[PDB]
Amino acid sequence: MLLGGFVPRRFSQFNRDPCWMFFIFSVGFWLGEYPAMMIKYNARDLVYDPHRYVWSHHDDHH
Amino acid sequence: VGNGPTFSTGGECMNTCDIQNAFPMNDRGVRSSSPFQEPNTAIYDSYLAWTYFQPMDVHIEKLPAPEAKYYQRHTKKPWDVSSTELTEIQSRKKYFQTLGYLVAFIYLYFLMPKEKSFSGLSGPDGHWIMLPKGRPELF
Amino acid sequence: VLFSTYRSSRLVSKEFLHGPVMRFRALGEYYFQRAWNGTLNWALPGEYRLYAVMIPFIYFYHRWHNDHTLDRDHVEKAMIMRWGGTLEDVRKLSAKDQLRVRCFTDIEKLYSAYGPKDTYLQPPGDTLPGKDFYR
Amino acid sequence: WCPEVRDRAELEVDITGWQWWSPLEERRLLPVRLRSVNEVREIMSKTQAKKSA
Amino acid sequence: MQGSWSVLKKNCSNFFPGLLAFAQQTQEAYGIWLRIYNRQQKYGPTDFVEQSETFSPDYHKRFHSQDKNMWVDKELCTEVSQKEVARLMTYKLDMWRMAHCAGALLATGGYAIPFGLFWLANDTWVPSSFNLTGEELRAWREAQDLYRYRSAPSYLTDTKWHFDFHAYPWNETQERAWDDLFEKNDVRRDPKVVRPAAEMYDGFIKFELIRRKSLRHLCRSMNIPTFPMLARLCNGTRVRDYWNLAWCEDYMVITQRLHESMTDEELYDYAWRRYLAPYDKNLNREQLMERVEDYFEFLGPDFVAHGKAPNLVILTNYVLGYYNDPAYLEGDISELDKNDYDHLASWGKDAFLRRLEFENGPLRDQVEAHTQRLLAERAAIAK
Amino acid sequence: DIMVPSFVYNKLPVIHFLQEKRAEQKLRRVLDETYTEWTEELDQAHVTDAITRSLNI
Amino acid sequence: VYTRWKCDRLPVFQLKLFTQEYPMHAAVGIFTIIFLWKHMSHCSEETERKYGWWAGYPYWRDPIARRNETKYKQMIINNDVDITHPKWTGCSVEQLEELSRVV
Amino acid sequence: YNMLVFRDPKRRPQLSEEERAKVVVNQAEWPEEFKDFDPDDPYKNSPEIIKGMSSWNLFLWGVECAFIYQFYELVFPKSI
Ligand SMILES: CCCCCCCCCCCCCCCCCC(=O)OC[C@H](COP(=O)([O-])OCC(O)COP(=O)([O-])OC[C@@H](COC(=O)CCCCCCCCCCCCCCCCC)OC(=O)CCCCCCCCCCCCCCCCC)OC(=O)CCCCCCCCCCCCCCCCC
Ligand SMILES: CCCCCCCCCCCCCCCCCC(=O)OC[C@H](COP(=O)([O-])OCC(O)COP(=O)([O-])OC[C@@H](COC(=O)CCCCCCCCCCCCCCCCC)OC(=O)CCCCCCCCCCCCCCCCC)OC(=O)CCCCCCCCCCCCCCCCC
Ligand SMILES: CCCCCCCCCCCCCCCCCC(=O)OC[C@H](COP(=O)([O-])OCC(O)COP(=O)([O-])OC[C@@H](COC(=O)CCCCCCCCCCCCCCCCC)OC(=O)CCCCCCCCCCCCCCCCC)OC(=O)CCCCCCCCCCCCCCCCC
Ligand SMILES: CCCCCCCCCCCCCCCCCC(=O)OC[C@H](COP(=O)([O-])OCC(O)COP(=O)([O-])OC[C@@H](COC(=O)CCCCCCCCCCCCCCCCC)OC(=O)CCCCCCCCCCCCCCCCC)OC(=O)CCCCCCCCCCCCCCCCC
Ligand SMILES: CCCCCCCCCCCCCCCCCC(=O)OC[C@H](COP(=O)([O-])OCC(O)COP(=O)([O-])OC[C@@H](COC(=O)CCCCCCCCCCCCCCCCC)OC(=O)CCCCCCCCCCCCCCCCC)OC(=O)CCCCCCCCCCCCCCCCC
Ligand SMILES: CCCCCCCCCCCCCCCCCC(=O)OC[C@H](COP(=O)([O-])OCC[N+](C)(C)C)OC(=O)CCCCCCCCCCCCCCCCC
Ligand SMILES: CCCCCCCC/C=C/CCCCCCCC(=O)OC[C@H](COP(=O)(O)OCCN)OC(=O)CCCCCCC/C=C/CCCCCCCC
Ligand SMILES: CCCCCCCCCCCCO[C@@H]1O[C@H](CO)[C@@H](O[C@H]2O[C@H](CO)[C@@H](O)[C@H](O)[C@H]2O)[C@H](O)[C@H]1O
């Protein structure tokens, strides 16, 4: 119902409560998984599967 | 003062609820959050207003203890279970249920394999049951 | 006569596991039994910290289950179909090759309907193997 | 330690009386209060006059 | 009352003697009922004999009407005595329970035997004839009183809550009657003060509009079997018949002042059949006479004048109020010196709790003044 | 476990208030029925006058 | 004081709730359950292949075939069925031997 | 103030202006946590749950956990 509870005023206060500490850790995970995906899936050495045209989900579900 | 809870309020502002008259009003004009008398009741304004009572150390003239005759009623019946006993029973039951649900959650979301896997490395593919046995005349 | 229909017929003593039960109730009551924790039909509490804690936990365990149990099936199917159509054929590859294939599958998942269509449509004149390679 | 309230609430809920407001009974009982000394004197005078009549 | 092995042995030992006694009582009660039915059919009013139809104003469902479908035979004393009427009422109760049990047996063949074992282990639903000694009869009566205690409060609360949530009394006297009708048995209720509630409820709900759930509660409180309940007009018929017999007996006693000459045990039984005197209260003759006279006064002069009793619903509530014991309270007052939330002490106070204590604690006025002054200064600076 | 307890909890305050008002009403009715009875007794002057008549004065 | 929810044990309260509080709802629920298990409790092999598998039917091992094979082997072994009987084959045993020698 | 959809509750004043002006403020009695109290930042002086554990440290911890989750297989791949 969103009635009350501890509300940090800014980022620096998220360490003033264990629940908000876990929340900021989770937010860090959420936002930091994106740069990791950028680096991993846009890497120079990444190569498409040579057999990618052998089979695809499009033919399977069709 | 302790950190214990008080009479529950359900997040309702007693100055505007449909049963406001049942809650006594103090000198400051703030209705109590409980049937008791509260001197330091306050109202907080989030998206919705809610009444709050802060416990504090206050001395009240304590009337001397009466005799057991004038307040004890020995009308207990075999089916009767007190609120305290009910609370104890429910606490124990919910403790056991919570442990069981924790085990179930762990097994389901971290150990149980999904059935009918494409590679066949995990989960069962299903099988027939209730097959006839020792009934040659059936065929 | 065999079993009592009343809850008052206790099966254990009042002090059985009193300590652990009290600790459990202490954990339950500290954040929930408050004036500002006014639930909406018992489902949506008023405490902000409850949301802040539970939403990440629910997402984490659901995502772990999905990644390690649900999407794994699709990944394994793609690996099997694209590299021989049998599990032993896939196992004939090295761990690095399997990593490459699984990451390509993740690439396809991220692309979905907005990515380039050359990832599954073979352009004319392409020298890569076709669908009848293993047939 | 307030048995009457407990029993009444439990019985009302157990007979499909989910509602927690009783406007009519409150209206009947809302203005009830202990009388002042002067009011007591007036009531006693009324009772004495009635008995004399 | 919960089942027990001792009661099971008692009932098993007295099973066949109990059945034989029940058969003899059946013959006697059939004779008595034949006499009563012949008298009713011969001298009864046209509406009562023809079973005039009374339909509810909302869904037009037929139910017995207190005025038309109930008749008090003022001249029944010539043919049938008071003791015969009491015997008939007791046999009606026993026959109802035995009929339910026999129906279950016929329906389920030989599969009711374990349920019969459950039945014989409890005195709640066994016939009175199964008791061959005073102690057994006392235990049986205790079981019946326990069932009445279990059932009555629900009926009373249903009635009171429905009326108070859907209507209010018209005048002050009706308000007092309604408030005093549902007092606990520890206090004595004046029938004269409480009578107007009968008219008030007649205005709200008559016996012809009684709801099925309320009927089930009333039947539970009257030791009448309820499973299978079926349509509300079956147990309703049972209740009507029982209270018609009770009213006939009451008129006979009032006219002939039999209760004064009635002995102690017979008077206690007479009060018990009226749901006025529980056996566990160990009432003396003075208290029994007081309660019986209160019941007669509640019936009112109009009962003798014309045989018209007050509203049956309110009458049942009034009589069953004697089983509404005060809510139990056990434990010394010193127990109130303990603490309920000691297990939370180790947790302490978090930042939000500390803030709340600081703002709403003894220093609340100072904090409020400081905050308001700061906000006013900031607002002035902004402008 | 959840619903009926919550509704009983919601009920408690109104019932408590109504029962307090009912008790105060009972006390008020008890007080209102108290009246000081003043009885009138035969004036002794008539008795003295009768005594004089017996004296034949 | 007595109340069903507070004094009775869970099975008893359940029976009371669904017999004297919501009996029609329970009756309709049982009716619907019976209908569902009488008319919506079968799945053909083709249906399972089309939709019965999370990622698709693994034709490279045909688990349905193995399942049916195990079923039939168990039935034959337990019930002592002579699968060489003429009714199963449509021909006499001697004709079967002649065919075996031919092929 | 607000943090996303979470709004900080505010206590309603109870004292009138006349009564309020007569109140004498003595911050010496106030707890060290709440001195120079500001409604717009009541937890500025609130102690940290773990000494030396900043919010940014926890955010970086979560980022590192995400990086591990995404990159562990790249260094220790396993066969099907
Ligand atoms: C073998 C086949 C079996 C078939 C399957 C059966 C399945 C079981 C169903 C139940 C069957 C009956 C069980 C026995 C009951 C006892 C007899 C009886 O009626 O007692 C009176 C009594 C009447 O109750 P009431 O409320 O006082 O009656 C109000 C009337 O106004 C009362 O009128 P009144 O106020 O004017 O007073 C009259 C009173 C005045 O009398 C008295 O006061 C004297 C006492 C008389 C009654 C004595 C009863 C004694 C009961 C105990 C017996 C001993 C048990 C021993 C057990 C242990 C054994 C070891 O006398 C009466 O009570 C007479 C009632 C009318 C007769 C009813 C009987 C009709 C059926 C029999 C004839 C069948 C003919 C078949 C022809 C076939 C042609 C092809 O019976 C009851 O308590 C009612 C039954 C309670 C259980 C109901 C269960 C549901 C039934 C649904 C049936 C639906 C139709 C069938 C299909 C079912 C499919 C699901
Ligand atoms: C030789 C004798 C003389 C001759 C015979 C005479 C005639 C005798 C027959 C007539 C007797 C009538 C009077 C009976 C009175 C007693 C009734 C009674 O039971 O009282 C409760 C009675 C205790 O009574 P009490 O202690 O005296 O308390 C009485 C109070 O006044 C409490 O009172 P209350 O009012 O609170 O209690 C009432 C309660 C009564 O209920 C209960 O209290 C529940 C009793 C069961 C509780 C079970 C709890 C334990 C569960 C255990 C589960 C298994 C655990 C694991 C086992 C592992 C084993 C290896 O609720 C009800 O009344 C609900 C009624 C529900 C009716 C349902 C109707 C359904 C109709 C369907 C819809 C149709 C719609 C129309 C469709 C039309 C379509 C065309 O309960 C028990 O004794 C419990 C027994 C539990 C036995 C063990 C568990 C079950 C074992 C099953 C074995 C299966 C073997 C075969 C398996 C095969 C597999 C393939
Ligand atoms: C956490 C999980 C725990 C476990 C959960 C387990 C799973 C449960 C899931 C489902 C639960 C809900 C189900 C609801 C279904 C729908 C119910 C509904 O619509 O009811 C409407 C409606 C509601 O009833 P009501 O009259 O308004 O009042 C119900 C209250 O409970 C009345 O309350 P009251 O307070 O007013 O009365 C209290 C007291 C008042 O005292 C009395 O009334 C005096 C004593 C009366 C005794 C009984 C008299 C019966 C007279 C004849 C009735 C008609 C018979 C028709 C022909 C026979 C048809 C079979 O009555 C009693 O104490 C009744 C005792 C009954 C004990 C039996 C209860 C069942 C326990 C299990 C035994 C059977 C197990 C079979 C399966 C296993 C086999 C291996 O039902 C009726 O009208 C009753 C019709 C009854 C017809 C007979 C039964 C038909 C069903 C099939 C029976 C099969 C027997 C098999 C024998 C063994 C073969 C091997
Ligand atoms: C294991 C056993 C399985 C058994 C299965 C069978 C069913 C269950 C059996 C019985 C279960 C026990 C409980 C039953 C309910 C009890 C109700 C109750 O408490 O009533 C009290 C009540 C006593 O109270 P009362 O104060 O004396 O009188 C009531 C007041 O009048 C009341 O005053 P009121 O103001 O309320 O007045 C209104 C009252 C007035 O009514 C009455 O009360 C009078 C009595 C009922 C009269 C019913 C007949 C009406 C005329 C029918 C004309 C049909 C012509 C067709 C011509 C076709 C030509 C081709 O009610 C009505 O107006 C209702 C009228 C009926 C409407 C029927 C609508 C049906 C719609 C069908 C839709 C489509 C269906 C599917 C498609 C089919 C076609 C393809 O009882 C009665 O009056 C009679 C009760 C009869 C009980 C049922 C007997 C069952 C016999 C079963 C034999 C067959 C067994 C087969 C077994 C198979 C193997 C297992
Ligand atoms: C010893 C037990 C009693 C033995 C028999 C006693 C004497 C007879 C009794 C009465 C017989 C009634 C006959 C039918 C009457 C009219 C209705 C009808 O058309 O019925 C169709 C059909 C009967 O077939 P039929 O027409 O008589 O003749 C064969 C036809 O040719 C077939 O043609 P079809 O095309 O209709 O065939 C399709 C299919 C159609 O079959 C179905 O659709 C099955 C429907 C089942 C309905 C169940 C009703 C009760 C529901 C309670 C609430 C459950 C909530 C959900 C729970 C989910 C999680 C467990 O038929 C069948 O294969 C019938 C098999 C029936 C098996 C019944 C097994 C019940 C298991 C209940 C488990 C409950 C677990 C609770 C665990 C809780 C733990 C805390 O199904 C039924 O009658 C279903 C109801 C059966 C009730 C039996 C009596 C009560 C239950 C006793 C056993 C309890 C076992 C508990 C195990 C616990 C394990 C942990
Ligand atoms: C890809 C294809 C998609 C197709 C989708 C189609 C829609 C599917 C929707 C399913 C979900 C929603 C279901 C809602 C409920 C539907 C109910 C329904 O229609 O079911 C009917 C069905 C019809 O039953 P039936 O199919 O067994 O009918 C038998 C009829 N003969 C024998 C002629 C074939 O009912 C049941 O399934 C339950 C039957 C048992 C319970 C009732 C017993 C009592 C019957 C009383 C009358 C007869 C006996 C005499 C009287 C009593 C004597 C004791
Ligand atoms: C009814 C049985 C008749 C035949 C005699 C069988 C005796 C078998 C030996 C039993 C020895 C152990 C007994 C322990 C005490 C059991 C107490 C009991 O039954 O209580 C039920 C109690 C629940 O009670 P409440 O509903 O809470 O309230 C009860 C008060 N009304 O149930 C339990 O907790 C389960 C207890 C199970 C104990 C073992 C019972 C074994 C019964 C077997 C019967 C079959 C015949 C055995 C023959 C054995 C020959 C060597
Ligand atoms: C399976 C069925 C089981 C049934 C169980 C119940 C049976 C009950 C039988 C009761 C028989 C009563 O007997 C019957 O009583 C009535 C009423 O006095 C008599 O009735 C007689 O007097 C009345 C009243 O003056 C007249 O309205 C009536 O015309 C006349 O015949 C019958 O002549 C008599 O035969």
Dump the DSSP string for E252-308.
Answer: HHHHHTHHHHS-HHHHHHHHHHTT---GGG---HHHHHHHHHHHHHHH-HHHHHHS-
- Distance, in Å, from the CA atom of E163 to the CA atom of G34, rounded to the nearest integer, reads 42
Instruction: Count the neighbouring beta carbons within 10 Å of the beta carbon of residue B62.
Output: 6
Contact in structure between E32 and E84 (CB atoms under 8 Å): yes
C-beta atoms of H66 and A28 within 8 A: yes
The residue written with tokens 């020298």 in the block is C127
Contact in structure between E224 and E93 (CB atoms under 8 Å): yes
Ligand 6 pocket test: pick from G25, G35, G37 the residue with the most ligand atoms within 8 Å of its Cβ: G35
- Give me the amino acid identity at C113: A
Q: Who's near B116: CB < 8 A, 6+ residues apart?
A: B123, B124, B125, B126, G52, G53, G54, G63
- Distance, in Å, from the CA atom of D46 to the CA atom of D38, rounded to the nearest integer, reads 12
Q: Who's near E247: CB < 8 A, 6+ residues apart?
A: E70, E72, E303, E307, E309
Instruction: Count the neighbouring beta carbons within 10 Å of the beta carbon of residue E167.
Output: 14
- Establish whether the linkage from the previous residue to G11 is cis, with ω within 30° of 0: no
At F49, is the secondary structure helix, strand, or coil?
helix
Q: Which of B9, B26, B38, B47 to mutate to test the interface with H (most CBs of H within 10 A)?
A: B47
**B42 - beta bridge partners?**
B52
For residue E335, what is the DSSP state? G
Q: Who's near C19: CB < 8 A, 6+ residues apart?
A: none
At B101, is the secondary structure helix, strand, or coil?
helix
Who among H6, H74, H80 is closest to C98 (CB)? H80
Residue G34 CA, closest ligand 5 atom number: 43
- This structure's resolution (Å) is 3.5
The pair of structure tokens assigned to E184 is 């606990």
- Give me the amino acid identity at E342: D
Torsions phi, psi for A49 (to 5 deg) = -65, 130
Contact in structure between E22 and E98 (CB atoms under 8 Å): yes
For residue B63, what is the DSSP state? P
C1 in contact with E, Cβ within 8 Å? yes
Query: Which chains does A contact via 3+ CB–CB distances below 8 A?
Result: B, C, E, H
Contact in structure between H71 and A38 (CB atoms under 8 Å): no
Instruction: Count the neighbouring beta carbons within 10 Å of the beta carbon of residue B64.
Output: 5
D10 in contact with E, Cβ within 8 Å? no
The residue written with tokens 């293993």 in the block is C134
At C40, is the secondary structure helix, strand, or coil?
strand
Residue G40 CA, closest ligand 6 atom number: 10
State if residue E41 touches ligand 8 by the CB under 6 angstroms criterion. yes
Rounded to the nearest angstrom, the minimum Cα separation between A39 and chain E is 40
For residue A9, what is the DSSP state? S
Chain C positions in Cβ-Cβ contact with residue B6 (cut-off 8 Å): 35
State if residue G30 touches ligand 5 by the CB under 6 angstroms criterion. yes
Ligand closest to CA E40:
8
Strands B49-53 and B41-45, sheet pairing: antiparallel
| CA-closest candidate to residue E321, choices E145, E155, E147, E124 | E155
Sign of the alpha-carbon dihedral angle for H21, H27, H32, H35: positive
Torsions phi, psi for B40 (to 5 deg) = -115, 35
Instruction: Return the C-alpha torsion angle E42, E48, E49, E53, nearest 10.
Output: 170
Rounded to the nearest angstrom, the minimum Cα separation between A6 and chain C is 7
**B52 - beta bridge partners?**
B42
- Distance, in Å, from the CA atom of G97 to the CA atom of G75, rounded to the nearest integer, reads 25
Q: Say how many CA atoms lie within 13 Å of E130 toward its Cβ.
A: 24
| CA-closest candidate to residue A1, choices D45, C45, H19, E306 | C45
- Distance, in Å, from the CA atom of C62 to the CA atom of E293, rounded to the nearest integer, reads 74
| CA-closest candidate to residue D32, choices F16, F18, B32 | F18
Contact in structure between A14 and A20 (CB atoms under 8 Å): yes
Chain G positions in Cβ-Cβ contact with residue E327 (cut-off 8 Å): 1
G27 in contact with C, Cβ within 8 Å? no
Using the CB atoms, write b or e for G55-64: b if 16+ within 10 Å. bbbbeebebb
| CA-closest candidate to residue A33, choices C119, H72, C73 | H72
Residue E179: burial class (beta carbons within 10 Å; 0-12, 13-18, 19+): buried
Chain H positions in Cβ-Cβ contact with residue E348 (cut-off 8 Å): none
Who among G12, G56, G58 is closest to C5 (CB)? G12
Which uninterrupted H or E stretch holds B42? strand B41-45
- Distance, in Å, from the CA atom of E262 to the CA atom of E253, rounded to the nearest integer, reads 10
Residue C104: burial class (beta carbons within 10 Å; 0-12, 13-18, 19+): buried
Distance G35 CA to ligand 6 centre (A): 5
C-beta atoms of B118 and C62 within 8 A: no
Contact in structure between E360 and B42 (CB atoms under 8 Å): yes
Secondary structure percentages of chain D, helix, strand, coil, to 5: 65, 0, 35
Distance G38 CA to ligand 6 centre (A): 8
Which uninterrupted H or E stretch holds B52? strand B49-53
Alpha helices in chain C (DSSP H): 18-32, 48-65, 71-82, 87-91, 95-111
State if residue E125 touches ligand 3 by the CB under 6 angstroms criterion. yes
The pair of structure tokens assigned to E35 is 């006499």
F26 in contact with D, Cβ within 8 Å? no
State if residue C3 touches ligand 2 by the CB under 6 angstroms criterion. yes
- Identify how the structure was determined: cryo-EM
Distance E94 CA to ligand 1 centre (A): 13
C-beta atoms of A1 and B48 within 8 A: yes
Residue G75: burial class (beta carbons within 10 Å; 0-12, 13-18, 19+): middle
Rounded to the nearest angstrom, the minimum Cα separation between E213 and chain D is 9
State if residue E42 touches ligand 8 by the CB under 6 angstroms criterion. yes
Distance E235 CA to ligand 1 centre (A): 14
**H2 - beta bridge partners?**
H7
Residues of C with CB under 8 A from a CB of G: 4-8, 70, 73-74, 76-77, 80, 85-86
Chain C positions in Cβ-Cβ contact with residue E344 (cut-off 8 Å): 26, 29-30
Strands B41-45 and H6-7, sheet pairing: unpaired
State if residue E100 touches ligand 1 by the CB under 6 angstroms criterion. yes
- Distance, in Å, from the CA atom of E165 to the CA atom of E160, rounded to the nearest integer, reads 8
C-beta atoms of D26 and B73 within 8 A: no
Nearest CA in chain B to A5: B46
- Using CA atoms, how far residue G54 sits from A55, A62, E28, E312, G58, in Å, is 17, 16, 77, 67, 10
Nearest CA in chain C to B49: C36
Residue D20: burial class (beta carbons within 10 Å; 0-12, 13-18, 19+): buried
Distance B65 CA to ligand 8 centre (A): 70
Residues of A with CB under 8 A from a CB of B: 1-4
Strand spans (E) along chain E: none
Phi-psi region of B84 (alpha: psi -120 to 50; beta: other; left: phi over 0): alpha
CA angle A55, A58, A61 (to 5 degrees): 105
